Amino acid sequence: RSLIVTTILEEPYVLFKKSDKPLYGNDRFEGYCIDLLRELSTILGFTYEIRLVEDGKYGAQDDANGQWNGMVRELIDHKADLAVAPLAITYVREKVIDFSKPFMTLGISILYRKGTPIDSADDLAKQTKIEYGAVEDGATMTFFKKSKISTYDKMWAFMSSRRQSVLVKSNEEGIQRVLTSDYAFLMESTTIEFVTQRNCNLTQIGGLIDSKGYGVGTPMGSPYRDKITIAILQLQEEGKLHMMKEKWWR
């Protein structure tokens, strides 16, 4: 029937739409990814319902029991037909789900307060006073966990040794720690752009640590993946994706 689309709350990609009049169905949400989903639905001819991922996670594999979680696991378990969210396309996820071509490109970087001598991941990694970390079970944490690059392997050893104290459960928690304590938050450049424009005391530190894209996730072998890619390429070529980014970041 209608497709079930899982997502996760992350400003400005997906928000609860605030309104005085009761809101119903898909109108309860808004954001760049909500606009994307709508365009996908009219281009390809489907109807849908939005569900918030139940365990509140993007998706990582638990290496004690091999189990994936988050939106990734919902796709694996066929609890959702699509995942439409700021969902990073990654090699490890590609082994268990499929992605469309990217609708946005980005990289990991560092969010920290302005007016300090910290300039690079290296400045963070070579010291143990300033804490740093990422959202638990997200692709940024997983990048550090998998890295063979010495600066990032060292950073992961640090984060992992202090996991409960330095990994946070959300973007908002990470940002609040930066605003209030001696903390640097590893996060994606697209989201950094949004945050720094609204918190004038915050800044990106250094450049991009990797390069990746966000894509729409599907269960592996889904006939929707290639169709979604065709729709995304059309929105890109016509300038619609760029217009949506302007709408939600400006």
Ligand X SMILES: N[C@@H](C[C@]1(C(=O)O)C[C@H]2OC[C@@H](O)[C@@H](O)[C@H]2O1)C(=O)O
Name the site residues for ligand X (rule: CB under 6 A): 10, 58, 86-88, 134-135, 138-141, 171, 187-188, 191
Contacts of 35 (CB under 8 A, 6+ apart): 244, 247, 248
CB closer to ligand X, 33 vs 231: 33
Cross-strand partners of 203: 112
DSSP string, 6-62: EE--BTTTBEEPP-SS---GGGGEESHHHHHHHHHHHHHT--EEEEE-TT-----B-
Cross-strand partners of 50: 5
Q: Are 241 and 155 in contact (CB under 8 A)?
A: no
CB closer to ligand X, 88 vs 110: 88
- Distance of closest approach, residue 187 Cβ to ligand X, in angstroms: 3
- Distance of closest approach, residue 228 Cβ to ligand X, in angstroms: 17
Residue 121 assigned to a binding site: no
- Distance of closest approach, residue 101 Cβ to ligand X, in angstroms: 16
CB closer to ligand X, 177 vs 224: 177
> Cβ-closest residue to ligand X?
138
Residue 139 assigned to a binding site: yes
Residue 86 assigned to a binding site: yes
- Distance of closest approach, residue 1 Cβ to ligand X, in angstroms: 28
CB closer to ligand X, 102 vs 122: 102
Q: Is 102 helix (H, G, I), strand (E, B) or coil?
A: coil
Report H helices in the chain.
32-44, 70-76, 91-94, 121-125, 139-146, 150-161, 163-166, 171-180, 189-196, 224-237, 240-249
Report the interhelical angle of 240-249 vs 32-44 (nearest 10°).
150
Residue 172 assigned to a binding site: no
- Distance of closest approach, residue 12 Cβ to ligand X, in angstroms: 10
Q: In what order do the strands lie in the sheet with 217-219?
A: 48-52, 3-7, 82-83, 217-219, 97-99
CB closer to ligand X, 23 vs 204: 204
CB closer to ligand X, 46 vs 102: 102
Contacts of 9 (CB under 8 A, 6+ apart): 15, 16, 52
Residue 193 assigned to a binding site: no
Residue 223 assigned to a binding site: no
- Distance of closest approach, residue 89 Cβ to ligand X, in angstroms: 8
Annotated binding site for L-glutamate: 86, 88, 93, 139-140, 188
Annotated binding site: 86, 88, 93, 139-140, 188
